[PDB]
Symmetry: T
Subunit: 64 residues, 12 copies
């Protein structure tokens, strides 16, 4: 059985790096992370000093 957690990563650099940021967090807290699916991308502009790229991913991990 796989389970997914819905995470939004952030980066001041790129959408790829924002995806990595979410996956990094999943790997800190979960064993057996196997894949991630991008489900949204966006940019925060008017509440941050530098534009912040966001990539939302479903991060799948194998249970057991």
């Amino acid at each position: 059985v796989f389970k997914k957690v819905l995470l939004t990563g952030t980066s001041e650099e790129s959408f790829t790096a924002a995806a990595d940021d979410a996956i990094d967090r999943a790997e800190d807290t979960l064993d057996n992370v196997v894949w991630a699916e991008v489900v949204d991308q966006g940019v925060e502009i008017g509440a941050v000093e530098e534009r912040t790229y966001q990539t939302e991913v479903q991060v799948a991990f194998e249970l057991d």
Copy 2:
């Protein structure tokens, strides 16, 4: 990093109140709740005494 939990709130009054019901529950159990996105709305009719409005939300919270 943000994480989302998928909650369905209920209310005998309105769709807004049902959304609030889900957010209230998230705030009971989670720190740093920042926003909610409505993803579905419906009404339970034929298993309840009064119509029950349901609003499903992804509730986002900031990790750390």
Copy 3:
């Protein structure tokens, strides 16, 4: 077996009340109405005296 009818309710008050308007009509004409799923919401503005909220629902009822 359940069947669904696709109804758009209207209200001069709210989206919840417009959903109720559709369900009320289903209950006038059908037995065993069990749930409704919201599939669209909108507002009629430029052909009515007061803004009219519309909520489109699939209204499910149990056959037999």
Copy 4:
């Protein structure tokens, strides 16, 4: 010919009131507003004093 503008209204009260807020703004600035279609709903929580309901609408107006 109709044209649509994509507006997000806000309210501290309800999703209906947030939709009205967007339509009110369109009517301040545009003639011949005829209808609005709801395309998204959400709630701002962690940057405001009170929860703020948001309703995004395509607001249609007739040209000429």
Copy 5:
């Protein structure tokens, strides 16, 4: 309030059995499981000995 967890069940037999596999896991770990919604189906072919059917479900459970 209901909460959903996003699980992918697997089976070497059928899509129904894969859905059951996810629900079985939810019921091992959660009280008050009430329904599941199928959101995806697929087949793993080129990393397994026998084709493996997968069914992804949102599994809803009632909180409290």
Copy 6:
């Protein structure tokens, strides 16, 4: 001209059998049933003795 009716079939056995259950009901009541399109699948768990598979289909029939 074809018309579609939106039916949810049920089965304690499988998603295929649930689809058949809806089509069977359509064929009891309608002439010239020609095809069905699956539009949703789910499982009722926490209001039934045995898990109940549901398959929602648009069932098309030819008019005249």
Copy 7:
């Protein structure tokens, strides 16, 4: 309250004419037909003498 019926019209000429074919049938059988929304278009090729254009519409009519 509005209700919608899901009809597929056919024509050997065009997608517009196929939409008209469905609306014509609705108007034969229903009062107060007010609008139609196109939801699908296709072409039957390998079971007919001439290509047959199909347009599926939700046809809305006002109740009462």
Copy 8:
């Protein structure tokens, strides 16, 4: 950079002609119109003398 405007054209003749009607209006008011994407089609029936075909398009134009 391209920008899109969301226009609904109308015609008493066809969906193609309704798309053209929107593009014609864009070309009256904008330079460098480059393409249009159809996003919806429908028919107004019960507020007009003759059925009116509508085609909604995103009309793209190049900035500068």
Copy 9:
């Protein structure tokens, strides 16, 4: 077994004719073409002498 090829037909006349253009090409190169499903429509404007209607279809053909 059916297979689909994803083709975009073009016409200076209409969306129907653009769909036909894609199907014509499929029939030049493939046996047992049975149906086509429209998946997109658009108009090329700013790289052609006359507006060019495009209709994208999945064209299904029976294998063997």
Copy 10:
């Protein structure tokens, strides 16, 4: 690099078996078939002796 082919399998038995039918055909003609994604399911009723279940899959295979 992976490539996908869009195949509709058929079976007189089940949706799973129809998916298998498409994958079987891909494996007859292609090396390195790795996975399949279900994209549609339906039932042919009024042109066959027995109901025919159809499952449409994107079948992925690794190039080289």
Copy 11:
């Protein structure tokens, strides 16, 4: 009230840079730009000297 404009940015380098290109243009012409949502990505190949990455964004700005 927020308003969105639908812009396609371009870059010979990356999808992130193409998103930035659209946001840069919005910021040249608009006050109070607050966020952008990615809605499409693509690559122009056969009308340019170098591949051109395109990212379409809804760019939101606060009115007043």
Copy 12:
């Protein structure tokens, strides 16, 4: 007439580079490649030494 092939490119570097990988393969094997549309993005994690970014594109090419 345009045709599309559905390819998933891979890269250990970025989503843009993964899109390029698919387009490169199309250009090795096909004449008149004109554009690509991104349809999915994901990351392989738990079967590779380094995270592998994947970008799925429909790659369009002009026939003849």
